[PDB]
């Protein structure tokens, strides 16, 4: 976003776009707030995501590989 | 997993705005401690010192000024 | 519908030279399973095309085939959306096969003649890119350049 690439700007260098803005937070910051509906959503989704941290730490299973 | 003021205790302030340019990312945004390795009360104390520069107009609200 | 694909199919060309290329016209010019009645006609349909457009039967067909040869095709694809279209350029296998589709499609109309002499009109028409089969080839060209909004 703060990119000039002074004389050659022939390639876009669009990697500060997606994980920062233009779809990511822009589909999550505007409406549907209630001040604590995120606490009905952070407690569901991050707990579904911090177990995605933990399920690789319980990795030994019926693979046998 | 880095070394800090855990067992080799130190202080962190607001005046050193160049190092306080590191505990925000390059827009003025305070990155969480989760990525930069630091600790919560070593950031929550510093979060006031971030805003004490933002109250004193040194590290911004936004990159449009 | 899902996994396995066979290779090529095997049709039987005209009795002067082995030509699977020209047979694809002929087998689609084959109406009602009748190779025979086509064999009387598709030679006469090739009698009128070649020496009135200019070339012999090697390259006189692409006078009336490369001019009706498309370059763009469109189809509707949604990933879950507003029922929109995601188009692609088609490969050589289907492209000029679609060019042969318009010519038999133009073969039916313009009726005061025989099937032999109805094929005389459009093959002579498609030779100089003034074909009614080419007219349908010019309609498929305008289904690009504005209807490619999703990719």
């Amino acid at each position: 976003i703060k990119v000039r690439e002074n004389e050659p700007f022939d390639v876009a260098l669009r990697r500060f776009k997606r994980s920062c803005e233009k779809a990511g937070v822009l589909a999550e910051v505007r409406r549907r707030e209630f001040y604590e509906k995120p606490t009905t959503e952070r407690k569901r989704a991050k707990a579904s995501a911090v177990k995605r941290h933990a399920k690789k730490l319980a990795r030994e299973n019926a693979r046998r590989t | 997993f880095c070394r800090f003021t855990a067992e080799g205790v130190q202080e962190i302030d607001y005046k050193d705005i160049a190092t306080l340019k590191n505990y925000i990312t390059e827009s003025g945004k305070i990155v969480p401690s989760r990525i930069t390795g630091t600790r919560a009360k070593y950031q929550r104390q510093l979060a006031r010192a971030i805003k004490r520069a933002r109250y004193l107009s040194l590290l911004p609200y936004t990159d449009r000024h | 519908p899902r996994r396995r694909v066979i290779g090529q199919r095997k049709i039987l060309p005209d009795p002067k030279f082995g030509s699977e290329l020209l047979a694809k016209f002929v087998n689609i010019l084959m109406v009602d399973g009748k190779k025979s009645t086509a064999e009387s006609i598709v030679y006469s349909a090739l009698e009128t095309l070649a020496q009135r457009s200019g070339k012999s039967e090697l390259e006189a067909f692409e006078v009336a085939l490369e001019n009706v040869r498309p370059t763009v095709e469109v189809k509707s694809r949604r990933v879950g959306g507003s029922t929109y279209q995601v188009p692609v350029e088609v490969r050589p296998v289907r492209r000029n096969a679609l060019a042969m589709r318009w010519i038999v499609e133009a073969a039916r109309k313009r009726g005061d003649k025989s099937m032999a002499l109805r094929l005389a009109n459009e093959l002579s028409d498609a030779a100089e890119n003034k074909g009614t089969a080419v007219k349908k080839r010019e309609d498929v060209h305008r289904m690009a350049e504005a209807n490619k909004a999703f990719a």
Partner: protein
Amino acid sequence: RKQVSDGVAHIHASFNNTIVTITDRQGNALGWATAGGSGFRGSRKSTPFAAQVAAERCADAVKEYGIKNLEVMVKGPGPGRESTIRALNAAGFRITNITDVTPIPHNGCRPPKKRR
């Protein structure tokens, strides 16, 4: 006319339409755009390919004034952000700064609720 040399392009964008205002370092804007003034009415009005033609309305009707080296300053949303900007690049101009500067808030006034 004055043939304004330095311009500042405010692509005041949304998903469907955009009132692009082709300003300068002053702010004065003789050129404009909408994706609705071009048209493609209906579902196809919700396209930044139409904002591209709106940015092509920012790429014509001003060749008389010659809007040289410019700051792309796009505000607002739009999920097709590789369509609206490069048509302004296709004008033959130069983009001095490629900025997606948006008025990002601190949540001062209340938002309503939707998607039911």
